[PDB]
Amino acid sequence: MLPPGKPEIFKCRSPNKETFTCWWRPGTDGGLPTNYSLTYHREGETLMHECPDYITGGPNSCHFGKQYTSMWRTYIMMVNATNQMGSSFSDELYVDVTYIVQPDPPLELAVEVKQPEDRKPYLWIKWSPPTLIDLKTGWFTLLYEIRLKPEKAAEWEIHFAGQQTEFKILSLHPGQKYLVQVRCKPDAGYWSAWSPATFIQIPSDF
């Protein structure tokens, strides 16, 4: 017998400055919504549009593919909830895709112990950018961080790797086992999550 609570768009994100997704949540303290509609318009247009894809980002989400995504242009968007009893509109949300970029974490983290005669031996860390980001045209620019730690240590060692996809770590405790992770950020936006750990044994003779 109750119409819906006020819904809220609580997150928007873009993994690569070419598409983006937004998520909303229902207002508790109203009746069950049986439908939602996300509508938006862009800055300097008067056309009103509907969410182009309600499927791709799953539950309570709107996904904007390449043909609906552009940079340096604000989206003004609103979601409404409806059931048989009536309806309720969310607050307008202003979104500039440029500032909601958070990449997925980097891929293929590999680690190796390199022991050469002539110089100090070292740890050699290698990884790859996330799929889905265009670094090669210069459209996207990525920075990386590595962290590593042996189990039970209080603090992580952090090393900024810049734009490289490999790094050399010189000083480690022989015999100790390390967890290593890598994350990345764009030039403007948020750090990704850390990758899964790869584990490395530092041999005793190091």
Partner: protein
């Protein structure tokens, strides 16, 4: 020497873009945060009228002479408003240290970036027409308005636009660097 040239240009633009963000934030948290100044900002940049690419595809399709010229036009169009932003804030009795500080850096670096850009055009496209034609900014009356809310909203539009445009210059420069030097195999 293109490679060192583009490297300097991109170092600058990335710095300026980052400063622009930090500045717009620091203004926003301190002055505007609680209020709807974000809504007054809808299509109000002096450079809106320019045809700038808005996604990667549009960027790739642009020819590189026109693209370089674009970047140059945007930079030229900012020399006036950045001058007044600095003069106005510096002329306050109690000027917020953070903001003014960034503003002065952006102003100075922006000159230098335009010098590197103009020099790039000279190497890459030596037979170009020496002809300025960039949009004109004329928002000084509003920055000087005695109505405080109107004044703040002028400043907000301006920093919002500076942030957009410097991010844009930076991205475009990155794009051209990969295209010109790396055949888009950066």
């Amino acid at each position: 020497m293109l490679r060192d040239l583009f490297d300097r240009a991109v170092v600058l633009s990335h710095y300026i873009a980052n400063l622009s963000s930090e500045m717009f934030s620091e203004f926003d948290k301190r002055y505007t945060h609680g209020r709807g100044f974000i809504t007054k900002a809808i299509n109000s940049c002096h450079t809106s009228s320019l045809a700038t690419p808005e996604d990667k595809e549009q960027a790739q399709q642009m020819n590189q002479k026109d693209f370089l010229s674009l970047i140059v036009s945007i930079l030229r169009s900012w020399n006036e408003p950045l001058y007044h932003l600095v003069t106005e804030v510096r002329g306050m009795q109690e000027a917020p240290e953070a903001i003014l500080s960034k503003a002065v850096e952006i102003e100075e670096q922006t000159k230098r970036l335009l010098e590197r850009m103009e020099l790039i055009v000279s190497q890459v496209h030596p037979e170009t027409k020496e002809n300025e034609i960039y949009p004109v900014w004329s928002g000084l009356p509003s920055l000087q308005m005695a109505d405080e809310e109107s004044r703040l909203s002028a400043y907000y539009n301006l920093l919002h636009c500076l942030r957009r445009d410097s991010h844009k210059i930076d991205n475009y420069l990155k794009l051209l660097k990969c295209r010109i030097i790396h055949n888009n195999n950066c």
